[PDB]
Design a protein around this nucleic acid. Sequence first.
DNA 1: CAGCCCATGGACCCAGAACCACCCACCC
DNA 2: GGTGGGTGGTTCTGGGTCCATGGGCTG
DNA 3: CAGCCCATGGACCCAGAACCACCCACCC
DNA 4: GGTGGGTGGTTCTGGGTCCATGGGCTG
Lengths: 171, 1016
Amino acid sequence: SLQLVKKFQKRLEDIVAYGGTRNESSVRAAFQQLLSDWAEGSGLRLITEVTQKAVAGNNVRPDGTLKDSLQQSRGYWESKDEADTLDDEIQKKLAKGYPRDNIIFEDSRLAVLMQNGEEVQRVDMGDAGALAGLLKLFFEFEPPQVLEFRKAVDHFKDEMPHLLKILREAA
Amino acid sequence: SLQLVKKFQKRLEDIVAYGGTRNESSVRAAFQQLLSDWAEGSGLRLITEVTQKAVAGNNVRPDGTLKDSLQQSRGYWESKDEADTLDDEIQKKLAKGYPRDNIIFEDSRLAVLMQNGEEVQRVDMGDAGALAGLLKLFFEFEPPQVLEFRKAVDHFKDEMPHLLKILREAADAAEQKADYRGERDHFVEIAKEAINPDFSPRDAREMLIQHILTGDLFTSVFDNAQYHEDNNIAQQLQQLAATFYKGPVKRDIAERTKRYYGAIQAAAAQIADHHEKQRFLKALYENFYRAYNPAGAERLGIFYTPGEIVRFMIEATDTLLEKHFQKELADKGVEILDPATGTGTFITELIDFLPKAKLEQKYREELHCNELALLPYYIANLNIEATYAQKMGRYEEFRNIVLVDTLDNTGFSGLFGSVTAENLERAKRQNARPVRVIIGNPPYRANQANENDNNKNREYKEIDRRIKATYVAASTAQKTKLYDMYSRFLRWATDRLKEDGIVAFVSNSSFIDSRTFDGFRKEVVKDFDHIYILDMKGNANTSGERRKREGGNVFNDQIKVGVAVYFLVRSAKDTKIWYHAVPDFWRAREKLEWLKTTKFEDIEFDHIRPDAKHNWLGQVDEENDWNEFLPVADKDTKQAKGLGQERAIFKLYSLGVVTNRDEWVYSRAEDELADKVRYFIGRYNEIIKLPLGDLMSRNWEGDIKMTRATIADAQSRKSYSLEKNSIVPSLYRPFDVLKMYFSKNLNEMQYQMPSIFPKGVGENVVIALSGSPAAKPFQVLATDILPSLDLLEKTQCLPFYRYTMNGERLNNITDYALKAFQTHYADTSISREDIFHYVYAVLHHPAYREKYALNLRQEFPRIPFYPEFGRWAAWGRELMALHIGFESVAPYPLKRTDEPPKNDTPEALALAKKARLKVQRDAAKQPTGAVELDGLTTLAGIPAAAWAYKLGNRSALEWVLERHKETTPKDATIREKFNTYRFADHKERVIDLLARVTTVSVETVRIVGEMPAETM
DNA sequence: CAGCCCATGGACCCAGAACCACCCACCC
DNA sequence: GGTGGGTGGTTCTGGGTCCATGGGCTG
DNA sequence: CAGCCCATGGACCCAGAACCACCCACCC
DNA sequence: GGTGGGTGGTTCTGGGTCCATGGGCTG
Ligand SMILES: C[S@@+](CC[C@H](N)C(=O)[O-])C[C@H]1O[C@@H](n2cnc3c(N)ncnc32)[C@H](O)[C@@H]1O
Ligand SMILES: [Ca+2]
Ligand SMILES: [Ca+2]
């Protein structure tokens, strides 16, 4: 919701004001709550710091992983410190094998979504309408499983005549 | 394999020869057919020109995709023309979106395999061996789904406790419906005559929770819902479950257990090989019992057999069937039975071994099985039925599995297996079958761990009567542990095999070298004609260098007992005992890889020739003059006051006091002990006033350690009372003088010690020694305080005096000894006290301990007549002084250094006053001469020689440190109420003892080094 | 003949430590 | 910009007990 | 009453037609 | 090395019939 994005924008201000620190560890709670509360309405849950074995045998631990009810990863998130070049730091993490299926790399001021290994959208987190749009894409990404399910439903239609032969013979 | 790659090369040359074209479209049919035929053997199939959407949305079409039965791609192949650059073409195709998960970029000349996005192997297609390797890797690549299933199986193990909570609550809410109680009462009474005479409603709720849990996963993960519908035993238990598990009750349980079943179902649905999914059956089996009934898992035995052992045991029974009975496992007439199926691993791997041509007949009337528990029965029947279905295409129900106690069904008239009627028929048919191979992993369990568990092994009258009349009768051992569940299965086997055949079992390897198994080693060579033992070591109940030599358990290091794969063949000279032991210091992996890569024929066995004491290994040398005196003999001890069979140095000998409740009877302080005993006597007195029903069924709260003796006198309503003159000092471990309550009421066996040290406090000196058969090195230590059975291994104390009933200290050194010594040395000066000190010295002599080592390990230490005598009894007067008065020897100068706590937090001090008592060692694991006592005090300056007074596998100093560490009491009551030992209160006393014992150690090492370098 | 001595070997498991990933303070 | 350190996770690795309980004795 | 007249709107499907993908032949 | 056929698959896309069957005559 835009209301959820607007509360993140306030939470972030308070963390740097009531806390005095702009360290990523302290400021990440604002987006963690945004992602967690959006997910609670979409039938998913953001589980934080879950380790995933990368393709190079190494283990990578993103700041958060969106997980379904079958404990299946549907999305990822890695926050950085605003005191860095997001673009440069995205490359370092992606070269250590950080997943590139549906990942939101996010410094406190700018958010990047890389769905299917390609940057779908880069927004500014000061704009509520823009972040809400980028988050919608991330939360509504169609994983390969649902596309394979659709493909097999289409094969079942053409293979129905042949299944009904076996069942007719039985009767 | 090689054959197919050779045909590939034969086709490639003939396509360019008979066709005169090098175009990819024509030369690709060679590799297409190589891959297609290799795939047909691996259960996959190469489909050609299958389109696939790439990430960027470009439909890419490789030259072929490897597909499984679930129509899922598990590999790809793209051939190019040889008139090109493979690396350049790979790069361009990859950039078009070509998958890199598992792809063979083929060129008529060379082929590269890019697995996981990275080149793994590039070979030349002109090599029949290199292409065979590349293709093996392509057709055995583990897809992402296989790895994500193994992750899910591991997580289900940890969530099984929580899942069984939902199911337990359900079975409890069923005990309110009278329909359930009525059916349960019918089941308990039909299972009290079929399974266990003591089947209880608690056992029935277990079988229900098993039927429910497995009747959900069989329909979800394994997709065999029909199994439960058609299984004979499942229909009897659905009749008890359909009294409650239905409608909204089932819907509620299903919605709360879906969070524990969701992940495995997701991953399992993408796996087609039953061989991969069978790891879940193995995990449900083991973990269910660990989380629900951890005690019943001990009774039944719930450990699966690593497949490597079962495959070796199947291959070897075949080599041995040919060599002795000129038959084969596949031949008609060879009926195989698995007495304890478990997960059915033995019968599933036999299905894989036997060829498809004979499998049908083998499956319908030759392979037989038995099981006692429901979850194992269900898991096995499904495993066996699905291995046949995957191999032979069609599904046939296995009708040769019975739910029966193998040892109870010895009807070769009982209602054993009368759970249902088809079960009873299967039991009677199996009894009549002519079994020739009995293969399996018998349950092993010698005794219960503590008497407070009330989990004693069941008694089997028929089988136990056979063991007493055969194995136990032939044994000369005082304690028979031949009633182990594995020796009961070994008796049953020798009896089920009525004519000729093999009994291939993997069991505890005590039979090869254990005093209790003397009678088995005598009887088994009469029943069998060829015995082939293969020791896999693994005994973790050992310590020190032995533990290191034993190595890892071939059972994935999950058990601590020694294991041996043995094959006992009876055909129709003398029995040939062949033996091969796995190398020492091997890890479990190394031991299991050997079994997978070795054939029975290649193994080099050694002909064991049993000795007259029926020992197969550890046979002593005979060229020695070991017939030299005798410290003590069972005859001298039981001599009937005639001084005619007094043929040993000492007359009476005794084992140290065993209490059976060491945590309740021994304490570092007198006050703490009196308080601990007070609680015991108090709670016992409340137990003796209970209904006879509760008394006889041991139905009391177990807050005190009740042993056989106590349980007997609590049913005899006897009343204990605190006699306060029973707290006496006692050497518990070397250089560890605790205090003990010496009462015949609270000490199980005081042995003959009420004669050595009467009333616990008495005047005597005992040369304590290790007993036989010893596992730790020979150890001898003199004491003036009551010893314990575990001061040294099976401590056998030899006293100097002997107190008669209300009598004098009759000298225990015999007159035969005195006269013999006064004769060899020819000096009547020799007195009994000189002989006492002579014996001590000889037993400390290093060369005697080395030469007669195997003798010392199996007998009472016989004493040589060393030339001098004077010098020896002198050395032994010094040794005994240091050892007995170790509390008075000069403290060696040790430098104490003290450091302050890290911070000033109250908790730092507390954490730093905790005992560490560790020998600071260097990188060569050799002592640096310092001991970190606690986080603050550190003593240093210990000489290196002081680490060599090794009493056992631990040095004297390491013994003092170990027996002063703050170790949590195993007993719960003592842990909660009587745990008041803080090293802080004993730090100064330890600083003193460590110094005194440093002197004892360096002095002993010196005296022992002055002794000669040769033994008479 | 029922107490009373005499063995004898046992179907794991869990604390140190290494080392690794990540981020924050700390130099640099 | 590493670097060490704070914190939490993830593999390995090493290393070892009191005490049940049948049988023989035995007065 | 059966035996003539008179309406009146209908729960798809499929042949081209691109247009790709791949690759042999054909120039270049 | 592009470049146009050759071959096969993979998406759109455009574009449109005779004839059931009740009710009203009708003689
Ligand atoms: C440790 S498992 C044997 C392992 C199995 N052979 C394997 O390879 O997977 C022992 C099994 O024997 C079964 N069993 C069958 N009859 C038995 C009997 N009479 N006594 C004890 N266990 C018995 C138990 O239910 C238990 O599951
Ligand atoms: Ca982060
Ligand atoms: Ca190709």
